[PDB]
Structures are given as C-alpha cells and as structure tokens.
Design a protein around this ligand. Structure first.
Ligand SMILES: *N1CCC[C@@H]1[C@H](c1ccccc1)c1cccc(OC)c1
Ligand SMILES: *N1CCC[C@@H]1[C@H](c1ccccc1)c1cccc(OC)c1
Ligand SMILES: [Cl-]
Ligand SMILES: [Cl-]
Ligand code: NA
Ligand code: NA
Ligand code: NA
Ligand code: NA
Ligand code: NA
Lengths: 7, 229, 6, 228
C-alpha cells in the first residue's frame, strides 16, 4: 500500500 | 485493571522505559493505564500513546498481510484459521484504541491540537479495521473513518496554520484513506497537492526547527504524490 | 561472550 | 494446554506460518503444543522448536539487558519493570525446560537428538543464571553444568569431533564456564581441546562440511581471543 505517517 | 494501583507518573515513566526496550505491548498497556486515570494527556504523552499502539498494530497488520497473501495463493483449514486468529487480535487492539478515544480522550472541549490529534487517530484505527473488513460491514467502517478524518480536517483548517505538523500528518493519512480505502484516487491526489502547496507558501514564517518538522511531513506528501502520478 | 547464533 | 484440541500436523503447519509472519510467540506456542502430543520430533521440528523459543527468549534477554543498564546507571520504577521482564523471561525458560524434562530428553531416539536437547537444557538454565541471584543462582549453575556435561559425554562417544552439533555444544558450554561459572580456565581448556580435535579431521570432510565445521571453529577462536 501507499505509505502513511510513520508516527 | 492491572494498572489501577500504579501511580500515573510511574505508568508514564514505565512507558518510556518500555519504548527504550522496544517492548511496545507493555508500552501500550502502561499508556492505557495512564489514560484511565482520567486526566488529559500532554503533547508528549499523546505521542507516547500513539507510538505504542502504532507499533503493536503495525506488527499485526504486517503479519495479517503475510498470511492473507499465503491464503490467496492457496485459493486444509489451517491458513484461514491462523489468518483469522491474527485478524481477531488486530481487531481487538483497534477496538481497544477506539474505546480509549471515545470513552476518555475525545472531547468537545479541548485545544485544537489535541482534538485534531485524537480524531485523526480515530480515523486511522477505523482505517485499519477497514483493511481487514469485507462487504457491508466494510462500508460502515469506511464511513466511520471518513467522518472522523473529516471532522479533524474541518477543525485543522479553522484553528491551525497550514504548516502545522499535526494538520499535515492528518492530510497525509486522509489522502491515503482516499487512495487505498475509499477508491477515490483523484480526491487523494487533490488533497495531497493542495496541502503541500499551502504549506510550501507558509514555510517562510517558520523557525529553523519548525521548518524541519513541517518539511519532513511535506516530503512524505510529495513522495505519495509522485508515487500516484 | 557470544554463544552459538542459532 | 490451549493447543490440546489441535492436530499435531496442523500445529506444525501453523508454526511454519507463524515463522513466515515473524510471529515468534505464536510459533513457540504452536511448537509447545506439538511437543505436548507426546511424539518424538524430527530434525526439522527440533529446529523449529529451538528457533521459536530462541527468538522469544532472545527478545526478553535483550530487553532485560537494556533495563539492567538503565538500572545500574541510576524511584523504584526501573527496578520494578526490570523485574517484570525478568519474571516473564524466567517463565519462558521454565516452559522450555519443562518440555525438555517432560519428556523430550528421555524419549530422544538417537544420540544427535539427545545431545541437541541436553545442550538446550544447559542453554535455558544458562539464561536463567544470567538473571538469578544468591542460592537460586548456585543451584541453576549446577543444573546447567550437569546438562551440558551429560551432552558432552554422549557427543564424545557417539559423534565425530567435527560434527556441528558437538562443536556448538562445546562452544556454548565454554561460554557457560567463562561468563556464568567464573571458570575461565575450564572455558579455555574446553574450547582449545575442541578446536584441536576438530582440526585433526578437517581434511576428511566434504566442502560443505568443512565450511560448517570451520564456521563454528571460528566462533570458538573468537572466544579464545577474547579470553586470551
Ligand atoms: N505519529 C503520530 C503521533 C506519534 C508519532 C509522531 C511522528 C513521528 C514521526 C513522524 C511523524 C509523526 C511523534 C512520535 C514521537 C514524538 C513526536 O513529537 C512530535 C511525534
Ligand atoms: N541453532 C540451534 C538449532 C536452531 C539453530 C540452528 C543454527 C542456525 C545457525 C547457526 C547455527 C545453528 C538452525 C536454525 C534454523 C534452521 C536450521 O536448519 C535449517 C538450523
Ligand atoms: Cl490458529
Ligand atoms: Cl512494572
Ligand atoms: Na486506582
Ligand atoms: Na491556532
Ligand atoms: Na511519478
Ligand atoms: Na490426532
Ligand atoms: Na519515579
């Protein structure tokens, strides 16, 4: 998937 | 509960130790106990809560994707059974987080920063439920995620500057929701682009350190835009 | 001192 | 046991799925359930059991070491949380030792498997000794030594000196002597004798076996260099 906020 | 007899400050201290030891299940349990003391969380404490559960559910999501892929390639009951076991545990963690948000943390009162932070989180955890849901139940979960993100967006646009990192991270995740969950890639792209452009225009107002905080999230928005277009 | 790695 | 209602073959299949998903606690629980069916384990299954629990205990050991370092640098919270992790680690070691004693060791059908399990018993007592204190630590140290020594006796009679299981046992027993039992002389003597007796036979080995044996000999060498 598309990356989301890593935090 | 098992944390009821522990001081709030000791729970926070132990959450920080658990993070240093990379014991994210413990970290989440300590932060849940801290929330249950009934006092608002500070900015630092909100981030601890979020990091803890992000890492717990992140491991579950990654495992679910591995098992779901194996199951799809295979299509005995063992693969489905074990994928279902992991799925149920994942759903339980999401329900725990959503329960903390609804029972303790989301308030009509509140400073914009906290209200947006928690509504974004609600959107995120409904989105994780949507990743594993099917059929009509999926539709209702998707609309719950959408509603939470949309309320957070409305507050963020009224009460925060366009460079605010919480606002930027919300837009990033809502745009991911549009692209990956809601079958709305054009809306995803439009949101990422307008968010990036409106932050760009306001960077000149920021200190060196705030500039770094905002531009790092802007860079994530651009990465998704360039992936998608 | 390290032990057998597996 | 929570796995008592699941077929043995299903437990093995799910242990392998758990490994692919990096779900090592699940993997260990599935392998525990398979062991508790009462049948012997194949070589592949033995390795699955060892991998699963090593990953679980290894994470606990690493966390314990982080917390112990913070504790030594330094309220009661650091100690309390170190003790919490310590108790969980002891629980996992007790679980593994219970599988070995009931009844993997006594049912092992060949020398390789018996040495494998007795070495494991020494290792898990060694992990207990790392966190134990006082009289309990002394008992644990004696238990580790006795398991390792029985494994040594069998390996010397039944396995060639280059056999990788025999070499790995000697490596771990020598680490026990040095790090746990405060017996550096015994650690050095054991590692040296093992190294020399393997070296004598390297010329008889195939290419792959030579690589296997010299890899572990180099692990012995690294420890000898640290200790000397
Ligand atoms: N993500 C959502 C809230 C926690 C975490 C953020 C974050 C980290 C990395 C990139 C983007 C957001 C976070 C964790 C820990 C400390 C802070 O300080 C703001 C933020
Ligand atoms: N260590 C003891 C038993 C499992 C593990 C061994 C091992 C791996 C690497 C170096 C030395 C020993 C092992 C792990 C995983 C798979 C296998 O066989 C395929 C062996
Ligand atoms: Cl299962
Ligand atoms: Cl604790
Ligand atoms: Na209380
Ligand atoms: Na404001
Ligand atoms: Na592109
Ligand atoms: Na059966
Ligand atoms: Na304290």
């Amino acid at each position: 998937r598309t990356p989301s906020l890593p935090g | 509960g098992a944390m009821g007899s522990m001081e709030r400050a000791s729970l926070i201290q132990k959450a920080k130790l658990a993070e240093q030891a990379e014991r994210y299940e413990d970290m989440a349990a300590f932060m849940k106990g801290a929330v249950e003391k009934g006092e608002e969380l500070s900015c630092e404490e909100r981030n601890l809560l979020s990091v803890a559960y992000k890492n717990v559910v992140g491991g579950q999501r990654a495992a679910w994707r591995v098992l779901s892929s194996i199951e799809q390639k295979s299509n005995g009951p063992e693969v489905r059974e074990y994928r279902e076991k992991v799925e149920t545990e994942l759903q339980g963690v999401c329900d725990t987080v959503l329960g903390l948000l609804d029972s303790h943390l989301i308030k009509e009162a509140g400073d914009a920063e906290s209200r947006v932070f928690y509504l974004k989180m609600k959107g995120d955890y409904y989105r994780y439920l949507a990743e594993v849901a099917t059929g009509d139940d999926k539709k209702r979960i998707i609309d719950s995620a959408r509603s939470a993100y949309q309320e957070a967006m409305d507050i963020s646009k009224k009460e925060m500057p366009p460079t605010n990192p919480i606002r930027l991270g919300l837009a990033l995740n809502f745009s991911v929701f549009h692209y990956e969950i809601a079958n709305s890639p054009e809306e995803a792209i439009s949101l990422a682009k307008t968010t990036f452009d409106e932050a760009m225009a306001d960077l000149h107002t920021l200190s060196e350190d705030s500039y770094k905080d905002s531009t790092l999230i802007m860079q994530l928005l651009r990465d998704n835009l360039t992936l998608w277009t | 001192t390290p032990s057998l790695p597996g």
